[PDB]
Amino acid sequence: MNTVPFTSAPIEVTIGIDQYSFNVKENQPFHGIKDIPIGHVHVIHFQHADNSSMRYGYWFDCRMGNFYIQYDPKDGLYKMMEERDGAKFENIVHNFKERQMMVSYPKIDEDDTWYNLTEFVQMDKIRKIVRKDENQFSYVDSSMTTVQENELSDPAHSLNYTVINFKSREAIRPGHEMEDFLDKSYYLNTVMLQGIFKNSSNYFGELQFAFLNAMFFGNYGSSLQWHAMIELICSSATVPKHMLDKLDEILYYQIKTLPEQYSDILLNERVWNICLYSSFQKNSLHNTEKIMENKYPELL
Amino acid sequence: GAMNSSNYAELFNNDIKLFVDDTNVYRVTVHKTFEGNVATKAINGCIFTLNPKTGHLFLKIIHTSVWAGQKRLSQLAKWKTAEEVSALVRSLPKEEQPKQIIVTRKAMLDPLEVHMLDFPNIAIRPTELRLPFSAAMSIDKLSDVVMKATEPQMVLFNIYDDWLDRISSYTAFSRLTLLLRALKTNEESAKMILLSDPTITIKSYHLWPSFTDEQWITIESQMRDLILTEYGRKYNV
């Protein structure tokens, strides 16, 4: 079990850790989050009491270093940092625990939600999508745009998701125009799985990461990316059976976890009605279909 | 964006553009089978691809053999249209390739767009206009060449005959669309109006009669009266 200490909490802020969140008051004696489960990525995120705009946060994995939060009054945000002095860092973490100024990562033992949402998400891949190689953790916020968005302006701050475009030469083999557009199997399996992602796990990892950024930060281009990767699979007639079953599970936990109030902006009506009811894979998402009908029958 | 009443004069600037109409690509007769079930029989069709500024028509004949052994033919028809249009563009010298292609039915956008990915700088546009190009098979010479064909065949026409010698493209397109609108709403009457007078003939290299200017005015008024009459009848107004 690992710890992310906070130097202090100078401004009133809602702090999230994965799917949990706490309200912290201006200059409340808050000094970090403990008992964070080793073995998964995590995201710590923030929304200032004064600016319900720009949710922001940091993806990290505690196996990759000792990380802490420190408010910067110049840039006006809670920053993640790395402490390279392992001894100095154990000393801070122990003193804060002794004084019990830390909240406990509040996991229910029965609960596999966070595992289910992050199963294929791997910190090394996140750091290729969020390129900032001097840090072992990755910053994401509400306003960051994706590479594809930039094409249709600052590249240093971009989400370098894999570009998916159903009306592109990449997607459409010459002479198979109609076939490939109506049946994306060759784009999914040869171009994307075998070519770019190399395996289904990396593909599912990007898909889950895009979902989590749309959910946690209302990052619009991540939501586009999540829907695109879903649609590519659902619009392929030939999909490995193991990928369909896993997809059903992935989507089920994403739909399960989404805040009910956000179903309007976070769920693309066209994509979901097409995936669940028109696509080759209509009949292959039984759990996802069942949870969608019982929780968001309006959208459908 | 879409083409509508507002940007109507853009058809007649010097940016090369083509209308594509697919309504006559996949044509069938519906009949009963011996067992009393319904069946279709395809007949030859055509893609109506027209430069509205110059009159040049690129009439790609679609022979029934295209359909042999294929499923979902109405969907395939859209993709075949897009394939043929794309090949037409590739066949044209660079300086004759259109800058825009305007499809008369929105369902052609994705098929053409996909077929034209090699031409990213050719813009594929829908239209809000309710153009009467389906009535092209009401023009006797176009219908005859389609129905006589024994193989895929491209036949080139000028759909304005020699009218541009005397009127502008804008006026020529307005005449063409009035004639076709009339043929669409009441073919028999439309055709009666055009041929009533046997002393006004169609040149072997033309589609329409050699009306004088004054006779075109009488014709156009007759066509307008036809269209209004049929409107009152349709809607009881």
From Swiss-Prot, chain A:
The gene is AAR2. The modification Phosphothreonine is found at T257. Belongs to the AAR2 family. Residues 244-265 are annotated as: Leucine-zipper. Heterodimer. Interacts with PRP8 (via RNase H homology domain and MPN domain), competing with BRR2 for the same binding site. Component of a U5 snRNP complex that contains at least the U5 snRNA, PRP8, SNU114, AAR2, SMB1, SMD1, SMD2, SMD3, SME1, SMX2 and SMX3, but is not a component of the U4/U6-U5 tri-snRNP complex. Its main location: cytoplasm. It comes from the Eukaryota. Phosphorylated on serine and tyrosine residues. This is A1 cistron-splicing factor AAR2. CDD domains: Aar2_C, Aar2_N.
From Swiss-Prot, chain B:
Changing D22A: Reduced growth at 30 degrees Celsius. Strongly reduced growth at 16 degrees Celsius. Strongly reduced growth at 35 degrees Celsius. Changing R105K: Severely impaired growth. Reduced growth at 30 degrees Celsius. Strongly reduced growth at 16 degrees Celsius. Residues 7-237 are annotated as: RNase H homology domain. Changing T104A: Reduced growth at 30 degrees Celsius. Strongly reduced growth at 16 degrees Celsius. Changing T23A: Reduced growth at 30 degrees Celsius. Strongly reduced growth at 16 degrees Celsius. It is found in: Nucleus. Functions as a scaffold that mediates the ordered assembly of spliceosomal proteins and snRNAs. Required for association of BRR2 with the spliceosomal U5 snRNP, and the subsequent assembly of the U4/U6-U5 tri-snRNP complex. Functions as a scaffold that positions spliceosomal U2, U5 and U6 snRNAs at splice sites on pre-mRNA substrates, so that splicing can occur. Interacts with both the 5' and the 3' splice site, as well as the branch region. Has a role in branch site-3' splice site selection. Associates with the branch site-3' splice 3'-exon region. Also has a role in cell cycle. Component of the U4/U6-U5 tri-snRNP complex composed of the U4, U6 and U5 snRNAs and at least PRP3, PRP4, PRP6, PRP8, PRP18, PRP31, PRP38, SNU13, SNU23, SNU66, SNU114, SPP381, SMB1, SMD1, SMD2, SMD3, SMX2, SMX3, LSM2, LSM3, LSM4, LSM5, LSM6, LSM7, LSM8, BRR2 and DIB1. Present with 468 molecules/cell in log phase SD medium. The MPN (JAB/Mov34) domain has structural similarity with deubiquitinating enzymes, but lacks the residues that would bind the catalytic metal ion. This is Pre-mRNA-splicing factor 8. It comes from Saccharomyces cerevisiae (strain ATCC 204508 / S288c). The gene is PRP8.
